[PDB]
């Protein structure tokens, strides 16, 4: 029931998010590992208290090697896995770049506006491809051989799981994408009109899809609660964005494409 303009948009959407989408990670190589053996950094403290979540490493010989981080004791200890979730942050950077520059859509906005919806969207979109690999009964982002076990209160959490509870398609998951990523009132978008028109269009093709192939009850005002997600996705978007700046300012970590993306310009 979509039309065929709808149906050739979900295709290239699905196939972009085919190419540069590693669900297997076998690509995350080289990356750094937790060592072997005053009001700011009382909030840095409550920032980092999220990030505390254990390491599985499961290798091609069947080894299996497990970090569990420290506890909060009022040092340095907090920012033991800041160096290597910085590698798998920009890891999932490099794909979400990827992931737009294969989009016709993307491709043909001005390269000014290319960049400014890449910024604001980026951690955005980056979420939204964790989600396809978390285990909700587990708790444990999936990612390959690496995974990333918890050791609802704390808003990225229960977006996670309630994300997950709406059991979504492929193809909503990239229409997801794809609204976040064309957001028209990103900081600095100039072709805010057309930007809107094409957001529009993903949107209205996610509500065609979700009524021709979901009749079911509980699927009754789906396309709704998507787009409250999203809404709740780019409040988490900024507050975690502050939670970086904070840390950043008194713990260095943020790698060179990471400082691209929110703007620190390293001077
Ligand atoms: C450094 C890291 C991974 C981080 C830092 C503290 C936390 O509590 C969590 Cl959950 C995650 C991060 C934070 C915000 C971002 O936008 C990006 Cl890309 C990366
Ligand atoms: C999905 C994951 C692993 C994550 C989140 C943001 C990132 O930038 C990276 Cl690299 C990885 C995560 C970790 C701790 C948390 O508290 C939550 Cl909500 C989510």
């Given amino acids: 029931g979509l039309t065929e303009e709808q149906r050739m948009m979900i295709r290239e959407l699905?196939?972009?998010?085919?190419?540069?989408?590693?669900?297997?990670?076998?690509?995350?190589?080289?990356?750094?590992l937790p060592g072997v053996l005053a009001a700011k950094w009382s909030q840095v403290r409550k920032d980092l208290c999220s990030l505390k979540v254990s390491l599985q490493l499961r290798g091609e010989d069947g080894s299996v090697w497990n970090y569990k981080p420290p506890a909060d004791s009022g040092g340095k200890e907090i920012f033991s896995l800041l160096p290597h979730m910085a590698d798998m942050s920009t890891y999932m950077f490099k794909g979400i770049i990827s992931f737009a520059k294969v989009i016709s859509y993307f491709r043909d906005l001005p390269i000014e506006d290319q960049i400014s919806?890449?910024?604001?969207?980026?951690?955005?979109?980056?979420?939204?491809?964790?989600?396809?690999?978390?285990?909700?009964?587990?708790?444990?982002?999936?990612?390959?051989?690496?995974?990333?076990?918890?050791?609802?209160?704390?808003?990225?959490?229960?977006?996670?799981?309630?994300?997950?509870?709406?059991?979504?398609?492929?193809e909503e998951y990239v229409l997801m994408q794809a609204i976040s990523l064309f957001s028209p009132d990103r900081p600095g978008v100039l072709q805010h009109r057309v930007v809107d028109q094409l957001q529009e269009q993903f949107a209205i093709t996610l509500k065609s899809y979700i009524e021709c192939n979901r009749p079911?009850?509980?699927?009754?005002?789906?396309?709704?609660?998507?787009?409250?997600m999203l809404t709740e996705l780019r409040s988490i978007n900024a507050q975690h964005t502050q939670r970086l700046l904070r840390i950043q300012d008194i713990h260095p970590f943020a790698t060179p494409l990471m400082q691209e993306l929110f703007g620190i310009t390293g001077s």
């Fill in 14 to 32: 699905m196939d972009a998010q085919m190419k540069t989408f590693d669900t297997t990670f076998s690509h995350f190589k080289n990356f750094r």
């Fill in 117 to 170: 919806l890449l910024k604001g969207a980026a951690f955005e979109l980056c979420q939204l491809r964790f989600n396809t690999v978390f285990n909700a009964e587990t708790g444990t982002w999936e990612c390959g051989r690496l995974s990333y076990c918890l050791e609802l209160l704390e808003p990225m959490l229960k977006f996670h799981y309630m994300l997950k509870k709406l059991q979504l398609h492929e």
């Fill in 216 to 228: 079911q009850p509980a699927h009754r005002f789906l396309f709704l609660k998507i787009m409250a």
